Design a protein around this nucleic acid. Structure first.
Lengths: 48, 415, 50, 200, 50
DNA sequence: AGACGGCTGGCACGACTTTTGCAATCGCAGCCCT
DNA sequence: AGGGCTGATCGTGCAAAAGTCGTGCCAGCCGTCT
């Protein structure tokens, strides 16, 4: 229901195909948060 | 008169400063960039929140249709490649062979690409990717109901009689297609309502910007003009810097401050003089172009650069410099400064006419003509000579080319 | 633009010169027009049915 | 490019666990950015096109709305990663414009306001200096001394304009001092950590 | 975010970058011209406050 | 079915436009060469 | 002890070659009527 660009189309496809299955992805708002924090002299990144 | 020498009292080589000042007044928005560049060097001169809403953009609809439609992974890639080759009008920009080459797959064949293109053509609600006006017309006819008047005749005409329609060779089309006389006009009219360039409906964008520079309008019975206050740049001498330089303890620093102040003062004076000269030139131009300003383009006086130069004390070179990328807004609209100047055409009654006004009158006459019988260029020349053209229709032909007027044969069409 | 020139020779009077910017009622609004008015600045006298 | 894995490559995300945080470094900032902005111009009203070397400019921040390059040539999906010569622009999706940050060099040094301004003075607690001194020296009106052990002067003490001039007058070119953020930067780089930690 | 259509008029994000960019450009250009210490220090303080 | 005609487009020529490329001569005097 | 001579400061055009159009003028051709 959110900013996840790759999720809305996939869920519309699954619903019109009658799959009722979920694929999470990762919200774009968190990417905006990361980009905004990195604008300040503060390093933030995602580990594995 | 009487020969003599200097018996009572009464010029200049402008250097790089005044030379660049003359090189200024070429533009306004660009002048701001140069002014900022100089001011950088000169140190003594000084939610509900509106965010973009996504739109279909005439391509997201195609992508959504591709996603919803069932297609193979290779078919999906080919569909994406086809969607890449799209146009605002709606025709495929790149060739099918170009798409096959861009695919870079030995398997990618012309047959599969054609099948994908055919599926995509019916995919979107608007018929698109036809890559041919004939193809788009065929798609529209196929979408149209079978029970249509002269539908088969219209389809046959669209098939291979496109050239006959292009030249408006109705007699040739009737002779070749063996179509019914004055009845094929119904099929032609039906073909006319086929929505050419269907994709362009999804495309919508406008400039909504004129960036006016001058404002002249009629008031109290006379035209009054003024420079746009917002558009005119302004420079201010840094008072703190001037005070520091005046009381600078270091002699070298004071000398540098003095040199910078002199340069800044010269630049400011040059900018102010350029603005004032432009205002005066615009006022003088309006004084003589009031007829075109009020009555319209038809009442445009044939004017030359020397004509404007005579009314002012500046030279024709200054006129050309002023008449460089300058747009003035008035009640009539936004027009370029150079658009005022026009050619002089000899005319009956001794007067001379502006070639722009002559072309406007020619266009007005041509538009107001019987569609069955289009006016000949010689006929139009005679009609304008009835108003005193004194033209040989070659200049009329050039003006028609400027207005993209079609041929008399081409202009004529079935009533 | 040979394609556009051909289209204009075929259809014409559009030539893709203008885009549709017509004023259309937003969705979910049904009604009857009571009256329209038009205001034109001085200097323009189009006044087709003003 | 086979064009069958390139589209599959865009839609991918990592496990992305154990998010960390740390102070940034100038090298990391340079690595993040692709180009440098130099002009305050954002958009031109003459052509409605991205400016050159500025905000919203091409050759930085990525391409424009389409795969079409700004110059006009190399406008098709047939080109996937090539960069044109008349215009340096990667032919990609437009969404990448939201993932490319820029950089400005800022030759003059500058302190970070988030530090030395919260309740604990990071600069103050690093240098054992009062806040008043740090903001007074941050604005070119305190002229703190940097170093100099030969002179009878403390390493970190406030020396006003008159004081600085007279100190340089009698002590000569020995009592080195600065008045800007570079003073703080030098005082902070030219100090050990383990030795002061052991002393404390 | 164009309001009038003619002018976009960015605010709260770009005027600040504009200020910093022009001020840094003026300082960098001026620093290479052996400017007096007073003016360059004042320009540096302007840059820092920006 | 070969010629009339109007169009169109190439060709040319004086007459309006315009752009760039110049950057003159002038009175101080102390220092360096002879 | 006397000459050379050195750099400060200065300045809204124009003109000259080039270009470039307005206008007319010629050559062909195809739609057509003969």
């Amino acid at each position: 229901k959110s900013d996840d660009v790759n999720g809305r189309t996939k869920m519309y496809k699954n619903i019109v195909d009658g799959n009722h299955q979920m694929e999470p992805g990762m919200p774009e708002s968190f990417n905006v948060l990361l980009k905004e924090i990195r604008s300040l002299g503060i390093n933030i990144e995602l580990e594995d | 008169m009487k020969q003599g020498l200097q018996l009572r009292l009464s010029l200049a080589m402008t250097p790089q400063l005044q030379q660049a000042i003359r090189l200024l007044q070429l533009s306004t928005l660009e002048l701001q960039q140069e002014l900022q560049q100089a001011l950088e060097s000169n140190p003594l001169l000084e939610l509900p929140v509106y965010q973009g809403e996504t739109t279909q953009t005439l391509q997201d609809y195609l992508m959504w249709q591709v996603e919803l439609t069932p297609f193979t992974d290779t078919d999906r890639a080919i569909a994406t490649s086809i969607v890449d080759a799209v146009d605002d009008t709606g025709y495929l920009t790149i060739q099918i062979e170009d798409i096959v080459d861009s695919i870079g797959d030995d398997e990618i064949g012309l047959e599969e690409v054609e099948a994908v293109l055919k599926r995509i053509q019916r995919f979107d609600p608007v018929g698109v990717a036809a890559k041919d006006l004939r193809d788009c017309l065929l798609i529209q006819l196929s979408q149209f109901a079978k029970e249509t008047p002269w539908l088969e005749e219209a389809r046959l005409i669209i098939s291979d009689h496109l050239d006959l329609l292009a030249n408006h060779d109705f007699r040739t089309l009737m002779r070749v297609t063996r179509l019914k006389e004055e009845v094929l006009k119904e099929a032609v009219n039906l073909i006319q309502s086929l929505d050419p360039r269907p994709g362009q409906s999804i495309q919508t964008s406008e400039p909504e910007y004129v960036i006016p520079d001058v404002l002249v309008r009629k008031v109290s019975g006379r035209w009054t003009v003024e420079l746009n206050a917002d558009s005119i740049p302004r420079l201010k001498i840094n008072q703190q810097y001037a005070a520091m330089g005046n009381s600078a303890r270091n002699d070298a620093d004071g000398q540098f401050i003095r040199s910078n102040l002199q340069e800044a003062r010269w630049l400011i004076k040059s900018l102010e003089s350029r603005n004032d000269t432009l205002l005066r030139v615009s006022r003088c131009i309006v004084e003589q172009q009031q007829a075109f300003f009020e009555q319209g383009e038809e009442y445009m006086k044939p004017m030359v650069l020397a004509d404007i130069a005579q009314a002012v004390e500046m030279h024709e070179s200054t006129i050309s410099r002023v008449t460089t990328q300058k747009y003035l807004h008035s009640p009539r609209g936004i027009f370029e400064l150079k658009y005022f100047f026009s050619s002089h055409v000899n005319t009956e009654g001794g007067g001379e006419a502006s070639s722009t006004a002559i072309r406007a009158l020619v266009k007005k006459l041509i538009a107001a003509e019987n569609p069955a019988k289009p006016l000949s260029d010689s006929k139009l020349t005679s009609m304008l000579s009835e108003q005193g053209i004194m033209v040989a229709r070659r200049t009329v032909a050039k003006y028609r080319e400027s207005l993209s007027i079609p041929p008399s044969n081409q202009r004529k069409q079935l009533v | 633009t040979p394609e556009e020139k051909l289209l204009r020779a075929i259809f014409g009077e559009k030539a893709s010169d203008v885009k549709d910017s017509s004023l259309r009622v937003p969705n979910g609004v049904s009604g009857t027009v009571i009256d329209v008015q038009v205001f034109t600045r001085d200097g323009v006298e189009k006044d087709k049915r003003a | 490019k086979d064009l069958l894995k390139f589209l599959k490559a865009q839609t991918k995300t990592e496990e992305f666990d154990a998010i960390k945080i740390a102070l940034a470094s100038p090298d990391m900032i340079r690595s993040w950015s692709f180009g440098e902005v130099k002009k305050p111009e954002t958009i031109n009203y003459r052509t409605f096109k991205p400016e050159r070397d500025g905000l919203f400019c091409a050759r930085i921040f990525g391409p424009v709305k389409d795969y079409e390059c700004l110059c006009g040539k190399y406008k098709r999906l047939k080109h996937r990663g090539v960069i044109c010569e008349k215009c340096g622009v990667e032919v990609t999706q437009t969404k990448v414009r939201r993932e490319r940050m820029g950089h400005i060099e800022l030759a003059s040094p500058t302190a970070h306001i988030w530090f030395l301004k919260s309740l604990p003075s990071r600069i103050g607690l690093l240098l054992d200096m009062p806040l008043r001194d740090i903001e007074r020296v941050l604005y070119f009106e305190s002229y703190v001394v940097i170093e100099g052990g030969m002179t009878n002067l403390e390493r970190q003490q406030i020396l006003t304009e008159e004081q600085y001039l007279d100190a340089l007058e009698e002590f000569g070119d020995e009592f080195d001092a600065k008045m800007g953020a570079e003073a703080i930067q030098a005082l902070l780089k030219s100090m050990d950590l383990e030795q002061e930690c052991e002393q404390l | 975010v164009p309001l009038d259509g003619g002018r976009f008029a960015t605010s709260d994000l770009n005027d600040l970058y504009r200020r910093v960019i022009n001020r840094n450009n003026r300082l960098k250009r001026l620093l290479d011209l052996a400017a007096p210490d007073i003016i360059v220090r004042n320009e540096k303080r302007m840059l820092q406050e920006a």
